[PDB]
Amino acid sequence: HKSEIAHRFNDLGEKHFKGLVLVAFSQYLQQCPFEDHVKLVNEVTEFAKKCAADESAENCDKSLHTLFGDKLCTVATLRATYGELADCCEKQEPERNECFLTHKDDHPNLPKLKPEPDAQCAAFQEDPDKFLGKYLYEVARRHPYFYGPELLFHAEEYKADFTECCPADDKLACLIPKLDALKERILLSSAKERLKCSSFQNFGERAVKAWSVARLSQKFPKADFAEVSKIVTDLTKVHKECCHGDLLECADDRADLAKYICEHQDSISGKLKACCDKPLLQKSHCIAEVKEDDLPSDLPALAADFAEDKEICKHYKDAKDVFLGTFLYEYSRRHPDYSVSLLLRIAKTYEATLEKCCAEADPPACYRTVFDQFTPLVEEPKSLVKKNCDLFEEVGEYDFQNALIVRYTKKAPQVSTPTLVEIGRTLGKVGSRCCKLPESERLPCSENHLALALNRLCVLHEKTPVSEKITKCCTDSLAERRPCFSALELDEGYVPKEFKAETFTFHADICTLPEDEKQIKKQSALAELVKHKPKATKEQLKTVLGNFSAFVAKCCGAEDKEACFAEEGPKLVASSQLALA
């Protein structure tokens, strides 16, 4: 194509082109006001239209990196607001784009988005385009690795919620539960895509493919290995591009891949029919989220090919990545009841069994028992999920979250209290989600969502590193992460954090807060208690936290709340230390 920007504009259309370019700028420049971005978008777009009319015009030849980075580097008050990015603007491409990518704030600490139904419905009716763009801007800067097409799709859900509810009698009751549901989806989708980008960053393209082979084989058991391989090759390209802010290319290739999948849907899965009769944005999303197809009646026995064949060693040497990819494909497609990382551990164990056995004097006799080496790998996560769901059903979300905050603070007492609380709470929502699913779907749900939660912890740990053990578990192996974390215990020689009475003192300001924020305040204190008394048993900690709870509930119900906290607080702070020895 003579002009790549003209080509993307022609392919994607103005609405989505502008949308994606807005997302892209918002993610790189997280602090800038909405009006600054709208003009960068409007200027780039006008250029695209000029180029679409004449591809031979001056500068239309330039790459997208060149044109997008030049526009970023023109922003007012760059050196003041984005010091790191100004440095990047000295560089030529592709070094410039590589600099930009190195500098992206995952946790910018911007204010929490609260829906205001009257004000927003008013802004929606006066100017929908401005209102919908605002939502794209706010989510993009809050989540810098969110995939453009995914966000544009969710921007339309957000529009449909406002279209439906704003004319109605009760605006809040129609809208609040819908927007809360959309937020739930934004969070998970953001976490899934962040895990893909982190996999590229920490482990590379090979590991993302292996993850994709495993996951798509489970989703599409009817598809043959060539079809899975095809989709994985293309999907990995889409993901690398989106992760890298190349949102025009990502959007365009994503749409071509959905086209191919739907063209070949009879061969890939019977569950795609629902996805393939929709518009382009809706279709990519449905495919990405499609439920698993039923198992084929003609799945082949694996023993003959992967355990019994006497030429395996030659097979392993002469065609390594194709023999392993095929194994992973076969094992994964017949195990929708396994998690992705467990499948990856199984594949790693298969590979390692071959290296060991094929150096030995009599290989067939060694690798004959290779499938029996997988048994302990399956049982370990099955026990964890049964055990955690048992606790969750007994004690409920709040107490389950408290148990995990204790567990994880004991593993990583150097990690910040906000982070420890955030992870413990996220891991507790895993119980809510997964333990109520059908029993055969618990293990995949649990482990896969655990993996998302642990990857969040790792992304934070890249920014603020406090623990060598966390560094190893985050950076040694993608497959081994969750079991590396589960194996962590309290350091023998971690020095307890010095006691601060003010950390465990509560006040009347808590009483007015919503339930979740009250919980966060008490769960924060729980974490601190562990940090001061790391050797305290979880049962001591449960009791002590319960006294703080009974104390907060009492003084918040008092006639004089400040007097109650002032009187009853210090004694509980003193006695609590003695109960945790």
Q: Quick check: 478 and 448 in contact, CB under 8 A?
A: no
Residue 98 phi/psi, 5° resolution? -65, -40
Indicate left, alpha or beta for 437 from its phi (over 0: left) and psi (-120 to 50: alpha): beta
Name the one range near Zn ion by CB under 5 A: 36-44, 116-124, 463-471, 557-565: 36-44
Shortest distance (Å) from residue 309 CB to Zn ion: 4
Q: How many residues bind Zn ion (CB under 5 A)?
A: 20
Residues 443-502, interacting with Zn ion (CB under 5 A): 445
For residue 418, give both structure tokens. Answer: 């906000």
Residue 36 or residue 337: which is nearer to Zn ion going by CB?
36
Annotated binding site for Cu cation, which residues?
A: 1
Place of tokens 């382009």: 280
246 in contact with Zn ion (CB under 5 A)? yes
Residue from the set 37, 442, 481, 532 that interacts with Zn ion by CB under 5 A: 442
| Rounded Cα gap, residues 217 and 143, in angstroms | 29
507 in contact with Zn ion (CB under 5 A)? yes
Q: Quick check: 359 and 317 in contact, CB under 8 A?
A: no
Shortest distance (Å) from residue 284 CB to Zn ion: 8
Indicate left, alpha or beta for 241 from its phi (over 0: left) and psi (-120 to 50: alpha): alpha
Q: Quick check: 78 and 36 in contact, CB under 8 A?
A: no
Residue 385 phi/psi, 5° resolution? -70, -40
Shortest distance (Å) from residue 112 CB to Zn ion: 8
Shortest distance (Å) from residue 313 CB to Zn ion: 10
Shortest distance (Å) from residue 17 CB to Zn ion: 8
CA–CA distances in Å: residue 377 to residues 222, 325, 339, 384, 462 = 26, 19, 11, 12, 29
Name the one range near Zn ion by CB under 5 A: 184-192, 404-412, 421-429, 476-484: 184-192
| Rounded Cα gap, residues 95 and 446, in angstroms | 40
Residue from the set 180, 379, 439, 516 that interacts with Zn ion by CB under 5 A: 439
Residue from the set 76, 119, 226, 581 that interacts with Zn ion by CB under 5 A: 76
Shortest distance (Å) from residue 157 CB to Zn ion: 8
Q: Residue 513: in which H helix or E strand, if any?
A: none
Annotated binding site for Ca(2+), which residues?
A: 4, 11, 241, 246, 249, 252, 256
Annotated binding site, which residues?
A: 1, 4, 11, 65, 241, 244, 246, 249, 252, 256
Residue 412 or residue 457: which is nearer to Zn ion going by CB?
457
Q: Which residues contact 103 (CB under 8 A, 6 or more apart)?
A: 84, 85, 88
Return the amino acid letter for 382.
K
CA–CA distances in Å: residue 28 to residues 104, 144, 463 = 7, 7, 17
Residue from the set 10, 11, 34, 36 that interacts with Zn ion by CB under 5 A: 36
Asked whether the bond before 94 is cis by omega within 30 degrees of 0, the reply is yes
Place of tokens 């954090």: 497
Q: Where are the alpha helices (DSSP H) in 334-374?
A: 340-359, 363-367
1 in contact with Zn ion (CB under 5 A)? yes
Residue 195 or residue 346: which is nearer to Zn ion going by CB?
195
Shortest distance (Å) from residue 20 CB to Zn ion: 8
Residues 253-312, interacting with Zn ion (CB under 5 A): 309, 311
Name the one range near Zn ion by CB under 5 A: 238-246, 267-275, 474-482, 569-577: 238-246
Residue 29 or residue 174: which is nearer to Zn ion going by CB?
29
Shortest distance (Å) from residue 535 CB to Zn ion: 28
Residue from the set 6, 16, 23, 456 that interacts with Zn ion by CB under 5 A: 16
80 in contact with Zn ion (CB under 5 A)? no
Residue 4 or residue 253: which is nearer to Zn ion going by CB?
4
Residues 132-161, interacting with Zn ion (CB under 5 A): 142
Residue 413 or residue 548: which is nearer to Zn ion going by CB?
548
CA–CA distances in Å: residue 278 to residues 258, 274, 580 = 11, 8, 59
Shortest distance (Å) from residue 175 CB to Zn ion: 18
On the 0-12 / 13-18 / 19+ scale of CB atoms within 10 A, 491 is middle
Return the amino acid letter for 505.
T
Residue 177 or residue 496: which is nearer to Zn ion going by CB?
177
Residue 488 or residue 545: which is nearer to Zn ion going by CB?
545
Residue from the set 34, 200, 203, 494 that interacts with Zn ion by CB under 5 A: 200
Question: Using a CB cutoff of 8 Å and minimum separation of 24, what contacts does 562-565 make?
Answer: 562/507, 562/508, 565/506, 565/507, 565/508
Shortest distance (Å) from residue 125 CB to Zn ion: 25
| Rounded Cα gap, residues 391 and 379, in angstroms | 18
Q: Which residues bind Zn ion (CB under 5 A)?
A: 1, 4, 7, 16, 36, 76-77, 142, 189, 200, 244, 246, 309, 311, 439, 442, 445, 507, 509-510
